[PDB]
Design a protein around this ligand. Structure first.
Ligand SMILES: *[C@@H]1O[C@H](CO)[C@@H](O[C@@H]2O[C@H](CO)[C@@H](O)[C@H](O)[C@H]2NC(C)=O)[C@H](O)[C@H]1NC(C)=O
Lengths: 30, 49
């Protein structure tokens, strides 16, 4: 969205779903 | 392809809530690029994107 060609591509794994992965990682070991 | 007193460049023009000083003409961001220009006839605050 920047002026001079510089674009930032959002990550494939969004902050919400990676939180789900974390909760999964906690859930198994707890 | 706006040209506000010699500034050739491309970008959308929309009214912005910014308020310049009476002498101030141009708006710049942290990256030192134009993002706010004042109309030289009907003095107003416009956003460049
Ligand atoms: C530059 O000239 C224009 C000529 O239009 C001025 O625009 C007028 O501004 C007054 C301000 O009250 C309005 O009442 C008029 O209706 C405007 N004109 C038209 C045709 O609508 C403008 O103010 C001038 N600016 C400077 C800095 O001199």
């Amino acid at each position: 969205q920047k002026f001079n060609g510089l674009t930032v591509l959002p990550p494939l794994l969004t902050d919400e779903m990676i939180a789900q992965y974390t909760s999964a990682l906690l859930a198994g070991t707890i | 392809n706006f040209n506000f007193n010699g500034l050739t460049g491309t970008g959308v023009l929309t009214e912005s809530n910014k308020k310049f000083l009476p002498f101030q003409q141009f708006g710049r961001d942290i990256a030192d690029t134009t993002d706010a220009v004042r109309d030289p006839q009907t003095l107003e605050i416009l956003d460049i994107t």
